[PDB]
Amino acid sequence: ASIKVIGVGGGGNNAVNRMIENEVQGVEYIAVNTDAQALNLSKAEVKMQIGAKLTRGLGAGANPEVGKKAAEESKEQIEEALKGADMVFVTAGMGGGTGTGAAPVIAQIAKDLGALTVGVVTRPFTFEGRKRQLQAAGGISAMKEAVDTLIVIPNDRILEIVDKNTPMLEAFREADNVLRQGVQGISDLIATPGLINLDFADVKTIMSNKGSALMGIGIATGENRAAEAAKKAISSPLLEAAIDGAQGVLMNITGGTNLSLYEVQEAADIVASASDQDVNMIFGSVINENLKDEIVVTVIATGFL
Ligand SMILES: Nc1nc2c(ncn2[C@@H]2O[C@H](COP(=O)(O)OP(=O)(O)OP(O)(O)=S)[C@@H](O)[C@H]2O)c(=O)[nH]1
């Protein structure tokens, strides 16, 4: 009922902006940064500057230690901001200083408060350099110890979706959109009750912080949309392990008012047919009025180990 989405650092805050612009509902947004300048470009209602004393508003200069200590300096404000949350999503681009360093601290505060804590983060593009990869790896494992589930999106695979024409700025806008889809694929099923009844217990069921969780997305229009989006999702480049490896699978099929009973059934059956015979699978369905002839299928795969 109290669902919070908390973006951390530049990348995460940009993802929270795409979410606000697509009027994702049912969630309270919070933006967190060590950089005061960037913070004021956030559209989130609550804007939290962390590590005022340590960084004086100037960012964490690409050092995860500073991001971590910034979030520790602001320990009590993060607690106040999150009090009463049943569920907390923590988004960030891993690789820099504030995301990598602060996101784990914020995730741990949320778990400690009893929130169901899901992380949704990206691993950086290979073109960003070995040092960004290293820093990111470090924060990804830190995050896994601090969340109930960590969804990890490998940015390189985004380049296998958008065309090879795409320059950096547009590539990163796509990353904001994958991050949004990872949060929203889950939050939409739980923010409001759908036509398929789907509760917290159902969602707790697919939660594992043992191994990075992975997501697949598929989008289609036209008369064969259900099967095409289901099939694309199970074949998403973002889904680096095959879906049959997963012990847990959440599936979100979203569509417009013409989303049909047979499509739901078809998409659910495709995804279940690709999955392990003993998978624990929870399916949800939501109507998005703004979609017209397009459907979206998201799968979150967990418990690969
Ligand atoms: N989704 C998204 N990801 C971004 C964007 N800009 C950079 N990234 C990714 O996130 C990673 C971290 O960058 P960023 O969020 O901007 O740093 P920061 O966490 O704020 O860290 P800092 O030291 O500058 S204070 C980058 O390595 C890159 O992969 C963006 O605008 N949107």
Author numbering: 12 to 316
Publication passage describing the model:
We examined three globular proteins from three phylogenetically disparate sources including: FtsZ, the cell division protein from B. subtilis; NS5B, the RNA-dependent RNA polymerase from Hepatitis C Virus; and P38α, a human protein kinase. Based on this analysis we defined a truncated form of B. subtilis FtsZ spanning residues Ala12-Ile316 (termed "FtsZ truncated"). Specifically, we used Gene Composer to define structure-guided protein constructs for crystallization studies and showed that we were unable to obtain protein crystals of full length FtsZ, but did obtain multiple crystal hits from the truncated, engineered FtsZ construct.
To determine if this was the case for the B. subtilis FtsZ structure, crystals of FtsZ:GDP were soaked in the presence of GTP-γ-S. The crystals (FtsZ:GSP) tolerated the soaks well and diffracted to the same resolution (2.45Ǻ) as FtsZ:GDP crystals. However, the residual electron density at the C-terminus of subunit B was weak and the purification tag could only be traced to Leu316. Also, residues Lys221 and Gly222 on chain B were disordered and were not modeled. Examination of the difference electron density revealed that subunit A contained GTP-γ-S as there was clear density for the γ-phosphate. However, the GDP in subunit B was not exchanged as evident by difference density which was consistent with GDP. Interactions with GTP-γ-S and FtsZ are similar to those observed in the FtsZ:GDP structure except that the γ-phosphate forms contacts with Ala71 and Ala73 of the T3 loop.
